[PDB]
Amino acid sequence: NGVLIPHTPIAVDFWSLRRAGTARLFFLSHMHSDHTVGLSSTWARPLYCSPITAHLLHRYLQVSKQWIQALEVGESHVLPLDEIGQETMTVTLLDANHCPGSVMFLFEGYFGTILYTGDFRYTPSMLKEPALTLGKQIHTLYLDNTNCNPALVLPSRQEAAHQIVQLIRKHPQHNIKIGLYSLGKESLLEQLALEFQTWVVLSPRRLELVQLLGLADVFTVEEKAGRIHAVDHMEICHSNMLRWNQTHPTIAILPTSRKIHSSHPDIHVIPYSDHSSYSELRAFVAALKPCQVVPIISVPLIPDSVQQYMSS
Ligand code: NI
C-alpha cells in the first residue's frame, strides 16, 4: 500500500528503508496498521503527519517526537529537498475524512503538482478546499481506487449503520460485541449509544483515544455499565462466541470491507466501506481535472542538490 513518488525522495505510507533507498522525506496520512509496518522506537528518520496523527503515532508506536514534524491541516508548509539552503517543496495537508487524523497530501515542486489521496471518504465539502479552489492543475493524482473494482458491491457507511441498528433492534435482550480496528468507526459507536440509550464499554486505550477526539461522554470501561461492548476484531470468533454465550446471550458484529464468512450464526459480518464510491470519485476527478490518474510516467528534472540528497 506504500507509494514512492518516482524521481523524488518522497515516500508516503512507506517505511521499508531497504526497498525505499532514494526516500528522504517520509509522510504518514493516518494511523492504520495497513500503512504503518516498520515504524517503531528505532525509526530515526524525518516523518510528517497531522496533529491528531502526531499524538496517536507517538502514543501507540513509541516513535520519538524528535523525528515527527507535525503540520497543521489546510496550510502550506515548506520542506527542504537537500542538505543545503537551496531547493524546497510545498506540502498542503487536506482533511481526508477516512478516520481520525486522516489527511491527503498535496505536493508542489520540480516534480510538478501531485495529489496523494491515501484513504479518503469523499464529501462535497472537500471540493471547496482553498488549496484546490485556485484552479491549480494537478499533474498526477494518486487516487483511492478501493471501490473502483466492481468485484463485489459494498454499502455506504450509512447503509451499514442502518443494518447494524436493525440487527441490534431485533435483539433487545442480548449483549452486543463490535469488532473494530485501532482506528475509525468511533462516530458509529456514538450513534449506537444514542439510539440505544446505553454506555459503550471500551478498552482503556480506546477510551484514551475517544477522549483524544473529544467525543460525547457516553463511554466507560466498567463491563457491567452497558450492553454494547467494543472489542478488537480478532476477538470475534466461534470460541469466544461460546465463551460469551456461556454467561449472557451475546451477539457479535464485524463491520468490514472484506469478504468474510461468518464462522457462527450469532456473528454478523456487515460489509462496511469507509471509502469513496465510484460515482463520488467520478465527480471528484471531473472537478479536479487532473492531468493523469494513478491507482494506489513522466520523468522530472531532478535538481543537482536533490540527486545528492537521494544518494547517501
Ligand atoms: Ni486506512
Residue 241: CATH number of its domain: 3.40.50.12650
Using the mean position of ligand 1's atoms as its centre, give its distance from the Cα of residue 84 in Å.
35
Rounded CA-CA distance 5/67 in Å is: 21
Using the mean position of ligand 1's atoms as its centre, give its distance from the Cα of residue 189 in Å.
18
Using the mean position of ligand 1's atoms as its centre, give its distance from the Cα of residue 1 in Å.
10
How far, in Å, are 59, 168, 304, 306 from residue 312 at the CA level?
Answer: 31, 58, 14, 11
Partners of 122 in the β-ladder? none
Using the mean position of ligand 1's atoms as its centre, give its distance from the Cα of residue 56 in Å.
14
Instruction: For helices 157-170 and 186-196, give the axis angle rounded to 10 degrees.
Output: 40
Task: Please calculate the CA angle 107-29-77 and round it to the nearest 5 degrees.
Answer: 40
Using the mean position of ligand 1's atoms as its centre, give its distance from the Cα of residue 309 in Å.
30
Using the mean position of ligand 1's atoms as its centre, give its distance from the Cα of residue 83 in Å.
33
Instruction: State this model's resolution in angstroms.
Output: 3.1
Partners of 142 in the β-ladder? 116, 294
Using the mean position of ligand 1's atoms as its centre, give its distance from the Cα of residue 35 in Å.
7
Rounded CA-CA distance 128/305 in Å is: 36
**CA 236 from chain center: how many Å?**
22
Using the mean position of ligand 1's atoms as its centre, give its distance from the Cα of residue 29 in Å.
9
Q: Which residues span the domain enclosing 261?
A: 157-271
Rounded CA-CA distance 183/259 in Å is: 20
* Order of strands across the sheet that contains 267-271: 219-220, 200-201, 228-232, 175-180, 250-256, 267-271
Q: Which of 221, 185, 181 is nearest to 204 (CA)?
A: 221
Partners of 87 in the β-ladder? none
C-alpha cell of 38? 516498520
Using the mean position of ligand 1's atoms as its centre, give its distance from the Cα of residue 175 in Å.
28
Radius of gyration (C-alpha) of the chain in whole angstroms = 22
Q: Do 35 and 47 touch, CB atoms closer than 8 A?
A: no
C-alpha cell of 297? 510516467
Using the mean position of ligand 1's atoms as its centre, give its distance from the Cα of residue 3 in Å.
14
| Widest CA span in the chain | 69
**Cβ burial 203-238 (10 Å sphere, 16+ → b, else e):** eeebbebbeeeeeeebbeeeeeebbbbbbebeebbe
Q: Which amino acid is at 299?
A: V
Using the mean position of ligand 1's atoms as its centre, give its distance from the Cα of residue 310 in Å.
28
Using the mean position of ligand 1's atoms as its centre, give its distance from the Cα of residue 27 in Å.
14
Q: Do 49 and 28 touch, CB atoms closer than 8 A?
A: yes
How far, in Å, are 35, 68, 293 from residue 144 at the CA level?
Answer: 13, 25, 10
Dihedral Cα 110, 115, 116, 120, nearest 10 deg = 170
Phi and psi at residue 174, in whole multiples of 5°? -105, 150
Within 10 A of 170 (CB to CB), how many other CB atoms are there?
A: 8
Q: Which residues contact 222 (CB under 8 A, 6 or more apart)?
A: 201
Using the mean position of ligand 1's atoms as its centre, give its distance from the Cα of residue 34 in Å.
7
Using the mean position of ligand 1's atoms as its centre, give its distance from the Cα of residue 105 in Å.
14
Using the mean position of ligand 1's atoms as its centre, give its distance from the Cα of residue 172 in Å.
32
Rounded CA-CA distance 280/145 in Å is: 11
Experimental technique behind these coordinates: X-ray
Using the mean position of ligand 1's atoms as its centre, give its distance from the Cα of residue 32 in Å.
5
Strand (E) or helix (H) holding 159: helix 157-170
